[PDB]
A paper describes a structure:
In vitro, [name] binds DNA and nucleosomes but dissociates to bind nascent 60S particles and to partition them from chromatin through LLPS. This partitioning provides directionality for the nascent 60S to move into the nucleophosmin-rich GC, where its biogenesis continues.
The variations in composition and conformation among these structures suggest that 60S assembly can occur through multiple pathways, with states 2 and 3 representing intermediates in parallel pathways for RNA domain III incorporation, which can occur before or after ITS2 is processed.
Author numbering:
A (entry chain K): 5 to 28, 50 to 256
B (entry chain D): 320 to 335, 346 to 359, 473 to 501, 512 to 534
C (entry chain G): 88 to 120, 125 to 237
D (entry chain t): 51 to 249
E (entry chain o): 102 to 210
F (entry chain m): 199 to 247
RNA sequence: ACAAUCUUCUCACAUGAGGUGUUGAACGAAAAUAUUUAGUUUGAAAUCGGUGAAAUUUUACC
């Protein structure tokens, strides 16, 4: 309805799920085209797109890079009991020094699943990580833990787990992860609508008017157009 | 031969005499990271060195000893007798 | 100079520093009151020769001009035997200043912090390529006769 | 000779300097504008071989064509911006009246007819600065500290000072690249103490 | 006499076309120098080919800077015999490489 | 003056030469500095240092 | 002088708007349309592959 005064969703999402099952998890990515450049340059920061149905599995291990000292955050993780999810916390200084080489950085990357970062540390994270991390489909996210409280960290971790991750770069079209094939069609449609609202709100400069084409597909599927701009 | 423990560590995580004691000591405490902790822990190192003594003695010229020690979590094969 | 650039990070604390530090703990105990392993460079002939045999040494640097050459003449063979990358650095007085002594017959790097673990690995491959890859065969020819 | 390392070090500095300029100019057109002083004091700590073209011109625009030169600047939006551009090369602060007094009275140098001329006679000051109501050395210091109408003319006449680092004790004459530990950036009134040591 | 051509590998980040020229010049005059770079963004490929007037001068460097630990990198340089030298290792040599801003020109277009 | 012959060192010996275990000295904080520290505290208490 | 300033946060008001930075090489995904773009392997590996600012040419991230 926001896009073109109509919402041809749900039925398209259900059909895509049936087609994927027939063509026998594969991620669900929505292809969006804009009439103008979304960004003037590459923006190496996450887009905290909160959705009802998360795309990050709950079994994924998380590493939360924090500002120094690491002991304060490490004590906080112990107090909050998030050690089941927060696998390892590394200070910013110890991140710069301990892991320097391309080989060491690669292992320190593959040793986890999701690498969350503090709000005050996400800026310098562009370096001290290298193209090994920032380009091999593992970008940090800006988890807000500046309050320094167990509840604040627990709330941020829950929100980060339940939110999608996107990183805009200077182009006209981009793909955003919407879910998995195993996810329910209704849940995927709700997530797709939520991302669309976020896309028009803080991504597309012209909102739904700036959005030219919208299509959905899997990693290897065909981008079936969900809706098109009538004007 | 140098990745026997790694396969068991991964499989156990996915599906979560002295040699049996050595496995439990590391599992409770938990490749270079594994080799670092043992070489930095006194009680754990004694168990690990004992574990290699039992396994090599239990099993002679066919096994790659250096890879066997890496399986337990030591940098180099210890000076075990037989 | 690259070898000694690293070595001069792991210089053992002087007898001046070893006291000024230990007084700080003493006053902390005397009023009201634990650490990490001290990282430095291993020196001394008996101590180092033991380390190679115990395979605790990552890199051995042998003073080139020890006066009774009996002391180090067996070292390159032993370090080759245990597979410890070694080099024969020029002059003992250079190795002496690293440890705050007049002279050192032999140094050895046994373990460095993770921060400099990459630098040591880079140096070790250089000593392999510049010292042992080169020469090697020339080490098996009778010197002199010029 | 020149080793292959120094060629690297120049490049690393040049890209390090160049990236700093982009972040300083773009997205950071904001200056904190040191307040409560119309007059600042700026000296050049060090320069980098194969200078960036931008800094090379700007330093000349501030008359700091050579190292260890000392120049007064009237505080304003424009001057502080150029100082912010060349910040990693200059130590700047707020001189006190006394510190400015000894600078002129011990290291003040004039530019009479365009040669390196010491401010040895008050007649020369009156001769070259009479029409701007500047007659004496004491007129110079009063004008400079007060930054009057003739402040621009006086600063044009003044030759930059040379605060070469002093080497007296035995430790200084031996430590390599000794510059009294001169950092780069804002130093508040520490520049006064540095001048007191230097003059 | 005989045109010596030299390869240098494992270039530390920085040892670029100008830095090599002002270094190898004191060894001897350098005529045509190219350093391989990325087609898209002009980023360094970290290996360059240089030419020397004589192979004897060309082999001079190959026995000094070979395995030259530089910034943690072991410089790899040795003489490449002329039988297999191609025509244009120096196509565009000594010329400031053109990196075109593909993204911005697309947005303007 | 024949060329040097290495009839023993041509191979690399994987095991450490000594079999004895690592005494707990090399894992616990130094006892020798403890004598020095406690003697240092005593002088401070008794007013010698 | 293998040393140097790649940011341990800002603005408006709990919220919003920002932060400009990524070693190379190889196998590979089809889509939105020369930019993004699944999954991968590696020693920071390697051996041809439009625009000015200065004295016609000089730029080595413009």
């Amino acid at each position: 309805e926001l896009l073109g005064s109509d919402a041809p969703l749900e039925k398209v999402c259900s059909a895509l799920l049936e087609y994927e099952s027939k063509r026998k998890i594969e991620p669900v990515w929505l292809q969006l085209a804009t009439l103008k450049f979304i960004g003037n340059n590459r923006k190496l920061i996450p887009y905290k797109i909160a959705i009802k149905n998360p795309v990050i599995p709950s079994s994924s291990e998380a590493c939360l890079i924090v500002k120094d000292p690491q002991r304060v955050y490490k004590d906080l993780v112990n107090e909050a009991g998030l050690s089941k999810v927060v696998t390892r916390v590394i200070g910013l200084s110890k991140l710069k020094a301990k892991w320097n080489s391309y080989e060491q950085k690669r292992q320190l990357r593959d040793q986890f699943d999701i690498f969350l970062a503090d709000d005050r540390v996400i800026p310098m994270l562009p370096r001290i990580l290298g193209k090994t991390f920032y380009q091999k489909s593992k970008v940090p996210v800006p988890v807000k833990i500046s309050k320094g409280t167990a509840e604040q960290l627990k709330r941020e971790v829950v929100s980060a787990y339940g939110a999608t991750y996107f990183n805009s770069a200077p182009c006209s079209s981009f793909m955003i992860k919407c879910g998995h094939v195993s996810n329910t069609s209704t849940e995927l449609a709700e997530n797709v609508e939520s991302i669309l609202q976020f896309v028009s709100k803080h991504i597309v400069p012209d909102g739904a008017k700036g959005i030219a084409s919208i299509h959905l597909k899997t990693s290897q599927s065909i981008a079936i157009p969900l809706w098109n701009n009538p004007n | 031969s140098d990745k026997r423990f790694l396969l068991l560590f991964s499989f156990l995580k996915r599906n979560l005499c002295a040699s049996v004691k050595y496995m439990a000591e590391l599992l409770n405490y938990i490749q270079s990271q594994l080799e670092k902790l043992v070489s930095k822990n006194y009680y754990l190192q004694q168990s690990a060195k004992d574990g290699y003594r039992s396994y090599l003695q239990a099993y002679i010229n066919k096994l790659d000893l250096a890879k066997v020690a890496k399986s337990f979590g030591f940098a180099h094969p210890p000076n075990v007798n037989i | 100079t690259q070898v000694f650039k690293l070595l001069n990070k792991y210089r053992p604390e002087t007898a001046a520093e070893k006291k000024q530090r230990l007084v700080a703990e003493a006053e902390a105990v005397a009023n009201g009151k634990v650490s990490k392993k001290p990282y430095n460079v291993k020196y001394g002939l008996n101590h180092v020769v033991a380390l190679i045999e115990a395979k605790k040494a990552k890199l051995v640097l042998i003073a080139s001009d020890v006066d009774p050459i009996e002391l180090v003449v067996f070292l390159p063979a032993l370090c080759k035997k245990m597979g410890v990358p070694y080099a024969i650095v020029k002059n003992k007085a250079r190795l002496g200043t690293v440890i705050h002594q007049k002279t050192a017959a032999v140094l050895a790097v046994t373990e460095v912090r993770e921060e400099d673990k990459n630098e040591l690995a880079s140096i070790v491959s250089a000593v392999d390529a510049n010292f042992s890859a080169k020469y090697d065969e020339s080490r098996r020819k009778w010197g002199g006769g010029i | 000779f020149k080793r292959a390392e120094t060629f690297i070090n120049n490049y690393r500095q040049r890209e390090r300097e160049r990236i700093r300029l982009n972040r300083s100019a773009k997205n950071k057109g904001d200056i904190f504008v040191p307040d409560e002083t119309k007059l600042l004091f700026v000296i050049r700590i060090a320069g980098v071989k194969n200078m960036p073209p931008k800094i090379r011109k700007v330093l000349r625009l501030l008359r700091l064509s050579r190292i260890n030169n000392a120049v007064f600047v009237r505080n304003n939006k424009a001057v502080a911006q150029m100082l912010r551009i060349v910040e990693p090369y200059v130590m700047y602060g707020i001189p006190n009246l006394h510190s400015v007094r000894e600078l002129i009275y011990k290291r003040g140098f004039g530019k009479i007819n365009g040669q390196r001329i010491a401010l040895s006679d008050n007649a020369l000051i009156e001769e070259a600065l009479g029409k701007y109501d500047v007659i004496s050395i004491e007129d110079i210091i009063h004008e400079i500290y007060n930054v009057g109408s003739h402040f621009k003319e006086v600063t044009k006449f003044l030759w930059p000072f040379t605060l070469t680092p002093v080497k007296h004790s035995l430790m200084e004459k031996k430590v390599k690249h000794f510059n009294e530990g001169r950092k780069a950036g804002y130093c508040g009134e520490e520049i006064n103490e540095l001048i007191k040591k230097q003059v | 006499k005989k045109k010596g051509v030299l390869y240098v590998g494992r270039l530390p980040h920085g040892f670029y076309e100008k830095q090599m020229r002002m270094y190898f010049s004191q060894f001897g005059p350098v005529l045509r120098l190219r350093m391989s770079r990325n087609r898209k963004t002009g980023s360094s490929k970290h290996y360059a080919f240089i030419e020397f007037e004589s192979l004897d001068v060309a082999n001079v460097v190959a026995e000094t800077m070979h395995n030259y630990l530089l910034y943690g990198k072991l410089l790899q340089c040795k003489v490449i015999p002329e039988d297999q030298v191609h025509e244009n290792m120096f196509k565009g040599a000594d010329v400031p490489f053109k990196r075109i801003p593909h993204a911005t020109i697309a947005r303007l277009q | 003056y024949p060329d040097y012959d290495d009839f023993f060192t041509n191979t690399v010996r994987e095991t450490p030469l000594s079999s004895a275990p690592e005494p707990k000295r090399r894992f616990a904080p130094s006892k020798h500095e403890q004598k020095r520290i406690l003697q240092l505290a005593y002088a401070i208490r008794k007013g010698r240092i």
